[PDB]
Ligand binder design. Structure first.
Ligand SMILES: CC(C)(O)Cn1nc(-c2ccc3nc(OC4CC4)ccc3c2)c2c(N)ncnc21
Length: 461
């Protein structure tokens, strides 16, 4: 029997997004039609921490585990360059994106969410699997239904793969990490700490450990001190504060277990009178919008650098291929050159096999406006393959800007820039410098186009 090839069984439909350790692609079984979400981990870009057999055994165990609040794993594939982890697709998106879209949110809603998280974590810990990187974006809703169950993603991965050091991969990690993880000695209790921070945020909309940039946040976490002095804590039950305290207990051996947290009075009472936590929802909407804009700004700048890189690479490849020196290539040649560009850049999970490349080239060749067959001008192909991506990138940045601009003022204040660039970990003096060069009127605010220009100048343009 043959070692099984991922693309012999699955075809890619669309990219779902970048997650921790790699892109996730919506795929479909070629025989049965079953849709699945495939996390593809690039061996070049993600180092392993364990030996192959340690990884294999963990995969085999994960395939046997089943819990309603844990992502289901079906299959695992490995080739020369990649690991392919095939799991169930969930369509309800990230929890915090659902929450900001409601008018009411109470401790009852929070308790129901936390109970699910604790139930998942408890099961995973019984089986000796630790998350380590638990955060709001690892909490997916199963479907778009109002009542939908939460599915936790990424259990087991941090044990086997090294985290990215790149800030586009790191936004938001610092708030949630347990202090003991920072110093190196940690166990499954780190996941209770993370859950405690999530709960604190659900009930007030502010992180318990906060600060102006990543390192400032880590400094607060490492000291471990936090308060309930914010006004919005006055609407909150004492039993919720007690559970939080126990979850954010500094010494792990004295911190409550996941299982014990399920039996806590707060969970028992509030999942079995209650105002809406309106101020919390407001603060969550603002926190989420700020996080998503910082992320969008990082992705935009990274996409601009990737485009400078790939544009020149792709031109050199076609120039080499163009044996007539006449600037003309056929479809097969554009395909082979676009393939060679993948034979190095292992960024594009969605170009999974030759068929997906064929399709993408054809979108551009269709897109070559009007079509002459045989003599494609490769310089114009490069422009449109890359302008497509550039246009897409600009539109994604803009969506995030608009969502952040909740008053529809059209502008972001310099106070708000400071918050965004802090979260993006862009140097204060450096963005102020680029703001001076763009804002020569001391308006102390920027419109979208001005913001986009600042980003271009912060990535060498
Ligand atoms: C935006 C996104 C990156 O969270 C997208 N995303 N990420 C995942 C996701 C997340 C993690 C996944 N982990 C897997 O295996 C690891 C061994 C456990 C396998 C598939 C995984 C998929 C996901 C999903 N399943 N359904 C829907 N959206 C999903």
């Amino acid at each position: 029997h043959s070692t099984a090839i991922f693309s012999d069984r699955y075809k890619g439909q669309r990219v779902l997004g970048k997650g921790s350790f790699g892109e996730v692609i919506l795929c479909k079984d070629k025989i049965t039609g079953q849709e699945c979400a495939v996390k593809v981990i690039s061996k070049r870009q993600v180092k392993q921490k364990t030996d192959k057999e340690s990884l294999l055994r963990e995969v085999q165990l994960l395939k046997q585990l089943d819990h309603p609040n844990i992502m289901k794993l079906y299959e695992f594939f490995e080739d020369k360059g990649y690991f392919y982890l095939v799991g169930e697709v969930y369509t309800g998106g990230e929890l915090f994106d659902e929450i900001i879209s409601r008018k009411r949110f109470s401790e009852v809603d929070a308790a129901r969410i936390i109970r699910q998280v604790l139930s998942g974590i408890t099961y995973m810990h019984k089986n000796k699997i630790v998350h380590r990187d638990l955060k709001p974006e690892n909490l997916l809703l199963e479907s778009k239904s109002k009542d939908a169950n939460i599915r936790i993603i990424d259990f087991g991965l941090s044990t086997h793969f090294e985290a990215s050091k790149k800030m586009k991969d790191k936004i938001g990690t610092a708030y949630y990490i347990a202090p003991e993880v920072l110093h190196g000695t940690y166990d499954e209790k780190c996941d209770v700490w993370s859950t405690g921070v999530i709960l604190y945020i659900l009930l007030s909309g502010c992180p318990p450990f906060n600060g102006a940039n990543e390192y400032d946040i880590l400094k607060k976490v490492e000291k471990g001190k936090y308060t309930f002095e914010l006004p919005q804590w006055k609407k909150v039950s004492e039993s919720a504060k007690d559970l939080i305290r126990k979850m954010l207990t500094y010494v792990p051996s004295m911190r409550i277990s996941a299982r014990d947290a399920l039996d806590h009075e707060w969970i028992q009472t509030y999942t079995k009178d209650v105002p809406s936590l309106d101020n919390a929802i407001l603060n969550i909407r603002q926190f989420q919008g700020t996080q998503k804009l910082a992320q969008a700004a990082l992705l935009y700048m990274g996409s601009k650098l990737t485009s400078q890189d790939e544009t020149k690479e792709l031109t050199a490849i076609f120039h080499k291929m163009d044996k007539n020196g006449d600037g003309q290539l056929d479809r097969a040649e554009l395909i082979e050159g676009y393939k060679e560009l993948m034979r190095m850049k292992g960024q594009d999970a969605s170009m999974l096999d030759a068929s997906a490349v064929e399709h993408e080239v054809d979108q551009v060749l269709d897109a070559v406006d009007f079509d002459k067959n045989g003599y494609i001008e490769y310089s114009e192909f490069v422009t449109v393959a890359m302008d497509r991506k550039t246009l897409l990138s600009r539109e994604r940045l803009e969506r995030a800007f608009r969502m952040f601009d909740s008053d529809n003022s059209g502008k972001i204040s310099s106070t708000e820039l400071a918050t965004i660039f802090g979260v993006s970990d862009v140097d204060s003096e450096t963005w102020k410098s680029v703001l001076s060069e763009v804002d020569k009127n001391n308006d102390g605010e920027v419109d979208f186009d001005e913001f986009q220009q600042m980003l271009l100048k912060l990535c060498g343009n």
